[PDB]
Design a protein around this ligand. Structure first.
Ligand SMILES: FC(F)(F)c1ccc(C2(Nc3nc(Cl)nc4[nH]ncc34)CC2)cc1
Ligand SMILES: [Mg+2]
Ligand SMILES: [Zn+2]
Length: 343
C-alpha cells in the first residue's frame, strides 16, 4: 500500500508539439489504446492533442508554461497499480477522441471542452490507491478537511490542480480575464467532482431524463449534465477497448483494491467484499460493475450522440466476455502471480 510521489522539459521545448498522425495513424480513433504509448511520450502527446484541437492558438497559451504545467500534472500522480499518470493520460486521450469523433462543438462551448480536457488530466491527482470510505475510517488529514462536505478524494484532486496553477511558471490561464479565469476554476471543480461515483448515482435519473427529452444547447443545466456524463465516459473509457485491455485493467483495479483491503485488515477492520482478496470473485464483480455502472453510461452517450453506438456495443461485448471466462476463472481474488494472463 506504499505508493511514492516522485518529487516535492528541454526535449518538450525543442519538439514537444507533433502532428498527431506522427504519433500513430490510428491516434484519433476509438480503436486506439493510449496505454500502448510509452510513458516518456505522453507529455508530448498531451501538447499534440491540445495543438490538434487548436486550444494553444485559440486561447493564446504560452508553450513553455503549457509544457511545465503538463510535467507538473504528470509528477502530481503517485504509482498505485491503477490510479497513476497512465490512467489520467488515457482518460485525457478519450476526451480528445470525443472531440474528434462526436463534434462536441455543436453541444458545448469551446471553454467547456477545454475545461473537460484539463480536468481529465487533473481528475485523480495525488490519488493514494484508496477510496473515500478509507479516508474517513483511517481519520486521514484529507477526511478532516473534506469529509463533512463529501467526495474527499475528488475535493483533494481539485485542490492539487489549483496548487499546480498557483506554482510559478505553470499558470496556463494567467492571461485570462478575471471572469474567464473564475469560469475555468468553476468548470474544473464541477467536472472533477462529477468523477465521484456517488455523484453519478445521485444525478442518474436527471441524465436519463435529459436523453429521453433530448439535448437542449440553450439549457445551461443540460451543459452541466452533459459535462458530468462526458467526464464519467472518459473515466471508464478503458471499458470501450479490446478484451486484452479490459482484462489487464481489471487486474490493476483489483491489485489496488486488494491492497486497500489488506490495509483495512491490518487496522483491525473488515473491508468491503470487493476489496477482500479472500471473498471477491472478479468475473461476477466486473459483470455487476459493467451492468450497473459502465453500460448505462455508454447507453446514455449513444442516446445523445448516434456515432457513439460502437462504444456501447464494445462495452456490452466486454461484459459478455466476463460471462465466458467465468468457467475458466474458478478462484476468489487473483492468482499468486497477480496476473489474469491465464484467461
Ligand atoms: F464515476 C465513475 F466515473 F463512473 C467512476 C466509477 C468507478 C470508478 C472506480 N471503480 C471501479 N470499480 C470497478 Cl469494480 N471496476 C472499475 N473499472 N474502472 C473503474 C472501476 C475506479 C474507482 C471510477 C469512476
Ligand atoms: Mg477519481
Ligand atoms: Zn479516474
Amino acid at each position: 500500500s506504499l505508493y511514492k510521489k516522485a518529487g516535492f522539459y528541454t526535449k518538450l521545448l525543442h519538439d514537444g508539439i507533433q502532428p498527431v498522425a506522427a504519433i500513430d495513424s490510428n491516434f484519433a480513433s476509438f480503436t486506439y489504446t493510449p496505454r500502448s504509448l510509452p510513458e516518456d511520450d505522453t507529455s508530448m502527446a498531451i501538447l499534440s492533442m491540445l495543438q490538434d484541437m487548436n486550444f494553444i492558438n485559440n486561447y493564446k497559451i504560452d508553450c513553455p508554461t503549457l509544457a511545465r504545467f503538463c510535467l507538473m500534472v504528470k509528477k502530481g500522480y503517485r504509482d498505485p497499480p491503477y490510479h497513476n499518470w497512465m490512467h489520467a493520460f488515457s482518460v485525457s486521450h478519450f476526451c480528445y477522441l470525443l472531440y474528434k469523433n462526436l463534434e462536441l462543438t455543436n453541444y458545448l462551448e469551446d471553454i467547456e471542452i477545454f475545461a473537460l480536457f484539463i480536468s481529465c488530466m487533473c481528475h485523480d491527482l495525488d490519488h493514494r490507491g484508496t477510496n473515500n470510505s478509507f479516508q474517513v475510517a483511517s481519520k486521514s488529514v484529507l477526511a478532516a478537511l473534506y469529509s463533512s462536505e463529501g467526495s474527499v478524494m475528488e475535493r483533494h484532486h481539485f485542490a492539487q490542480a489549483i496548487a499546480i496553477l498557483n506554482t510559478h511558471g505553470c499558470n496556463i490561464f494567467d492571461h485570462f480575464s478575471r471572469k474567464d479565469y473564475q469560469r475555468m476554476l468553476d468548470l474544473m471543480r464541477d467536472i472533477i467532482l462529477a468523477t465521484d461515483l456517488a455523484h453519478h448515482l445521485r444525478i442518474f435519473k436527471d441524465l436519463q431524463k435529459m436523453a429521453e427529452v433530448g439535448y437542449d444547447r440553450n439549457n445551461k443545466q443540460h451543459h452541466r449534465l452533459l459535462l458530468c456524463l462526458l467526464m464519467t465516459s472518459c473515466d471508464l473509457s478503458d471499458q470501450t477497448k479490446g478484451w486484452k485491455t479490459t482484462r489487464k485493467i481489471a487486474e490493476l483495479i483489483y491489485k489496488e483494491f486488494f491492497s486497500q483491503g489488506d490495509l483495512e485488515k491490518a487496522m483491525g477492520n473488515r473491508p468491503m467484499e470487493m476489496m477482500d482478496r479472500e471473498k471477491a470473485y472478479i468475473p461476477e464483480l466486473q459483470i455487476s460493475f459493467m451492468e450497473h455502472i459502465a453500460m448505462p453510461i455508454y447507453k446514455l452517450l449513444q442516446d445523445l450522440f448516434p456515432k457513439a453506438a460502437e462504444l456501447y456495443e464494445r462495452v456490452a461485448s466486454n461484459r459478455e466476455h466476463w460471462t465466458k471466462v467465468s468457467h475458466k476463472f474458478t478462484i476468489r481474488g487473483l492468482p499468486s502471480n497477480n496476473s489474469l494472463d491465464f484467461l
